[PDB]
Write a protein that binds this ligand. Structure first.
Ligand SMILES: OC[C@H]1O[C@@H](O)[C@H](O)[C@@H](O)[C@@H]1O
Length: 470
């Protein structure tokens, strides 16, 4: 009943605990080892006004050079697994085969994977975590063009071929919701369209459509061409946020909350469940929502071995009072129920701590989508922004420790509920490059000293994880 007491021994023996990262956020060596640029290099370099402090991932926290140090920290941490992504423009600088296959980039991922394995840590590997190769962006518009589908398969194939003998858990995409909405609706993430210069009412829908197609076609490639020989599993990780009706007993708000789930999570989950978009998206987006061919529907339906969910926060939802994705949802998000916020702020004013949400999002996904195997692929919280603190003060992350305890507890509740969760990955292992927010937003269980070669030092939360989840 007390969440500070939660530990490995409240979970099945085969439950996988881990931490996470993504290539652009930690690797650095952006022009080292033959890596070609991604749309994020381009965004952060051409439009440093879009980044808090105008920073980028040229060096990030230097896991490109310090990977042996991350492996040692992961080993000391004692958790089962490490979720990281492959930088598409590292292994294929030009995005397609014709831009050349980068042997040194492959060698880096082999070294990381080998390091992880020699230390009993399972690699969980995401192919696409937003770093679309600039060459593809430039040649045809990246995910705006169906040409992205074939190129992504050839990339997935290269990765299965090179790494599949040792990597047994693959995700095609991480958070295409976030990628689609902030790249193409709000224009706040790479490639920064939407705020032809963009169109927030059409482009997010093509992007998501192509993302879904890319995902389906790479899953089919894995299933048909690698799975028998390699015996791994492939899925995808989705952005989630719990949507609670503003008024418990208002039919309108219950529908509004369900529509909000529909536009965020249903948007990707229904295609991979029934091969179509949610009814409410069809109704509210009309002719601006693309149709799948029957062949695409066959390919999308059931196209995963597992689904990863990413969870941070929650919101109340109510009905709303030219065209844009944001206005299509026809909802208004509310944070406060009569001056009572759904939960307290973290270091970020958008992250309201509501641990129960992770439980309701799990329960909701099993019910609505009937996913057989679920991983929490991301869950975590950011430190209050404060450059005044010494490391000993900074590393006492009480709020994170409680946040993890409380969420992990709720994951356990979801599993009692019937949700088959097979592991849980904290976001993140390292303080890292937090997209539009730069370095000031620290999600790590390992503190990074940005004044000193990105020195790693475990925060209280890492110590507790080691001691409680070995
Ligand atoms: O916002 C915190 C984190 O959110 C997750 O959805 C993304 O996958 C990470 O790349 C990001 O750093």
């Amino acid at each position: 009943n007390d969440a500070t007491r939660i530990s490995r021994s409240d979970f099945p023996a085969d439950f996988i605990m881990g931490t996470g990262s993504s290539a652009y956020q930690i690797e650095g060596g952006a022009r080292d080892g033959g890596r070609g640029p991604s749309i994020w290099d381009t965004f952060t370099h051409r439009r440093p006004d879009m980044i808090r402090g105008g920073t980028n991932g040229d060096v990030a926290v230097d896991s490109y050079h310090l990977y042996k140090e991350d492996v040692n920290i992961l080993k000391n941490l004692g958790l089962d697994a490490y979720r990281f992504s492959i930088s598409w423009s590292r292994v294929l600088p030009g995005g397609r085969l014709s831009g050349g296959v980068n042997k040194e980039g492959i060698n880096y991922y082999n070294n990381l994977i080998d390091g992880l394995l020699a230390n009993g840590i399972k690699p969980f590997v995401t192919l696409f975590h937003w770093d679309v190769p600039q060459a593809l962006e430039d040649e045809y518009g990246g995910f705006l063009s169906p040409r992205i589908v074939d190129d992504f398969c050839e990339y997935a194939e290269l990765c299965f071929w090179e790494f599949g003998d040792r990597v047994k858990h693959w995700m095609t995409l991480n958070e295409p919701w976030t990628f689609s909405v902030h790249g193409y609706a709000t224009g706040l993430y790479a490639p920064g369209r939407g705020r032809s210069t963009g169109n927030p009412g059409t482009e997010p829908y093509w992007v998501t459509h192509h993302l879904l197609l890319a995902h389906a076609a790479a899953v089919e490639l894995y299933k048909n061409k690698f799975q028998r020989g390699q015996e791994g599993q492939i899925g995808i990780s989705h952005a989630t946020q719990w949507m609670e009706p503003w008024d418990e007993n208002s039919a309108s708000d219950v529908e509004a909350a369900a529509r909000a789930l529909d536009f965020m999570l249903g948007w990707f989950m229904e295609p991979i469940t029934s091969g179509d978009y949610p009814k409410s998206m069809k109704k509210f987006v009309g002719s601006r929502l693309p149709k799948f061919s029957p062949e695409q529907s066959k390919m999308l339906k059931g196209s995963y071995d597992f689904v990863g969910l990413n969870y941070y926060t929650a919101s109340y939802v109510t009905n709303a009072s030219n065209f844009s994705y944001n206005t299509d949802i026809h909802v208004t998000y509310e944070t406060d129920r009569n001056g009572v916020p759904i939960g307290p702020q973290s270091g970020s004013d958008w992250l309201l701590i509501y641990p129960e949400g992770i439980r309701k999002i799990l329960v909701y996904t099993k019910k609505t989508y009937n996913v057989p195997l679920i991983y929490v692929t991301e869950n975590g919280v950011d430190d209050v922004k404060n450059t005044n603190l010494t490391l000993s003060e900074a590393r006492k992350d009480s709020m994170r420790l409680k946040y993890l305890q409380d969420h992990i507890f709720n994951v356990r509740q979801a599993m009692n509920d019937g949700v088959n969760v097979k592991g849980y990955f904290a976001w993140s292992l390292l303080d890292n490059f937090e997209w539009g927010e730069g370095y000031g937003v620290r999600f790590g269980i390992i503190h990074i000293d940005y004044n000193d070669n990105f020195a790693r030092y475990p925060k209280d939360s890492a110590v507790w994880l080691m001691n409680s989840f070995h």
